[model samples]
Target: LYFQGHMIGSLGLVGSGEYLPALAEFEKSLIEDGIANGKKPIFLQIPTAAGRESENRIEFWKQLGRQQADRLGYESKFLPVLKREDADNPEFVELVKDAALIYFSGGDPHYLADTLINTPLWQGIYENWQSGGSLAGCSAGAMVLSTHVPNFRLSRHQSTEGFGIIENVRVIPHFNKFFKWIPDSAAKILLDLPTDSILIGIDEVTALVKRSGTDHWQVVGDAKVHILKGLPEQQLTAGESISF
Candidate 1:
């Protein structure tokens, strides 16, 4: 089977919008590791502005991304996906086809999926990744990339929807800050979700990079990556590739 080249990365911070120095390093790591594998940098970003802190929040993220790319020595652009129509537009499909790596910025995971699901752009992203390109995100970016994201707006303690990114995996982000503890019901939900997919709990500044052609993954940052497989769980320290 062909590997799906994508990553679920996260960075914890004081305020959601203040700064993401960790994310800067995250990008660097992705670029360095990617090139080490002889892959050229063809990056695409989807900055979700809907749940951001301000009105011009999307632009703010786009600007930050550009600056980060300059620092990392990579060429990147933010994909324009505002409404549902933009997701299906032929122009969007072209953009997806050209990317080597696709990243989703933190915000509302629901909005991220709602906007991109069942669209031409979404299909292109999947095809590109399965063909060996990479995809990634952080915080809300990391959360929505999974099959399930807790409906945090309705209840911080509950989960209600599925974004269907990683079909079997259910990811819970911002682990150390808010929803750190593993509730009984939540664990049950993870078990009930597609059994083939694992439940990953990542703390801030922590990331788990699932490299293509390698079932094993590399963890990064200051915290741990918890993989709940079946009823039991396995933990991996940051900066190491885990054994499945």
Candidate 2:
């Protein structure tokens, strides 16, 4: 379904958002576009990916979300859902009803996907977005939006099912560093992707956003977004875009 112009929402895929002083222009554009119809936008931060980590780690993401919400002058709502039970709570589901933007922060992609899939909270989020609200995923957050979430730490090529919001594509975060860290391993993983699938590698603090009212996706932020299809790959820099 096309958003932007046709609807009052956007879909964003980010490599990472940690320690970035400036909000990437593409992300800011999603917020601006969501609020353009003269609606009061509310930013709902979902640190669900970090649910299994320490409280300190969870708090860090919360603070970051708060800072961004304050910076944008939007009412901030924190959905402190850390477990499967928390996701079933009616109150949590209700909180997502009017969100203009829902952000899935960086953490464990597997945990995030497993926890939200087939749950009431996820259903609520999906319905809200379908009704004209933006959606964003950073790092593990971005990874879970695809058909499968890869575990690069093990370098085993094993992956868990993802949210499947975007089909035929998988995301790799920290692409530049990871590629340089083990070139052969990276190459092996890319070469082993499922048939007819595309691989997108996003650099630190960068993002690939779907162009408004179109199927095209554009790169934004400090680095590049790589698109790999079979044996060939295309690199997109800030402001550059491409279609699958």
Candidate 3:
């Protein structure tokens, strides 16, 4: 419904992080696809979702981002936006500008969405993306890119506000493992989804990358990208591209 060709921006919805070598190819593809302008693009990593997580968990993400950047020969920095105040800080918002790629790691989707909405930092991210920057989110991070997120902590029938980057879309990460084990529960949640919602279940270690200025997307990494619209869900395996 919200189709705007000028709203061009690269998006990566990942199932999980630490996919190291598998994700490396997608990173390279992003550069090759003109998401970044230079040989040494500036990559900014956001650990905001892990704000309330253990120190080790936070450090792990920072380190992982650092390693990826190093491997890809890109300049990178971990932008620590922990609290809502941090999202509002002018200094923090400034760091988001001019980034070639901005990545959000997994943890608390609700907290990340609540903290970023209406903040200068989020606006900066959007502006950067509009200018051809690549944006990626893994797991919980992937969940908030939509207009609504399932109330994972509460009831399946309930929903929570998301960042609204991708409207009418919702994601369930770690789907291969979770979806198979709890098909009934997953169906219940899917049934309660808003009308016209497109539920995508991304498998672990996989990513669905959509090019800038287009509705078509390709699957990257080791697994399938499940798209649930009605009965008998559709699937896009690695190297497949489909328009949603």
Candidate 4:
């Protein structure tokens, strides 16, 4: 009853959060295994700004997507939104609809969530997912897809006020560096989500993917999946599903 399947893959992180090699491998996995020989092109949407340092490079995803498509023998469409409202534009949303795969690039989660949540494009993503489309995110793209997001600037994770209820999912990308600072206790202060919330940590260049109708989630790429609750943390890998 879910959509095509919910999946997450990472490319690379800049600075102390560097993660490029993992991205290359993930791209391979997505095309080789994820796509399963599907020839449909990939759609890369950037609603979050990258010209700023607070967010990841917009071009990194753009270029990687292009290269990925070419290397994997697939086509890719990269769409950049000049303004937040563009995400809601009927014409704009229509352009992104029904792609075999869709990826949201890294940036400000607050911006991404505030801009597109509950809008026409958001609905399109859901509709596409129901028809067997793959929804993926990188950095903020990965974060905003969940119910709670960690504000990189404040180093605090908080429940999104206006974001859509994307199941009970919660995600933290660039996990390697963020955890060193926010850890679990501090993160819990702002992201004190409900008991049913599912906490997923995606390390630099690492991704955790889950099939839509299945309870299992898989980890791809280099890093690890960290599930934090209270003082205890559990490290998991692909095909593992956990509930907090």
Colliding residue pairs in candidate 3: none
**Candidate 3 lDDT tens digits, 1-244:** 2232234568899998542877887875664443333222676889898898888988888888888888887777798888888888787677776666788888888888888878899998887777667788999889889887776446665677778888766778887776565657665774366534677889999999888767888898889888876435888889998776
Worst 10 residues of 2 by lDDT: 1-10
Residues 66-117, model 4: lDDT tens digits: 7756665556777666456677677767856646666676666677777777
Please, what is the TM-score per model? 0.75, 0.86, 0.87, 0.72
lDDT winner among the candidates?
3
Model 3, residue 209: distance off in Å is: 1.1
RMSD of each: 5.5, 3.4, 4.2, 5.4
TM accuracy, model 2: 0.86
lDDT of 2 by residue, 1-244 (tens): 2333345357888888742456534555676655662223777889899999999888887887787777666777889999889999999898776677788988888899999988999988886666567788988899889877765555545767788878877788877776676667656754355533788789988888774356777787989988766436778898897776
**In candidate 4, what residue range of length 10 has the lowest lDDT sum?**
9-18
- Of the two candidates 1 and 4, the one with more favorable lDDT, higher being better, is 1
Among residues 3 or more apart in sequence or in different chains, the pairs in candidate 4 whose N, CA or C atoms overlap within 3 Å are 5-212, 12-19, 13-19, 218-238, 219-238
Runs off by more than 4 Å, candidate 2: 1-8, 37-40, 152-158, 180-187
Question: TM-score of predicted model 1?
Answer: 0.75
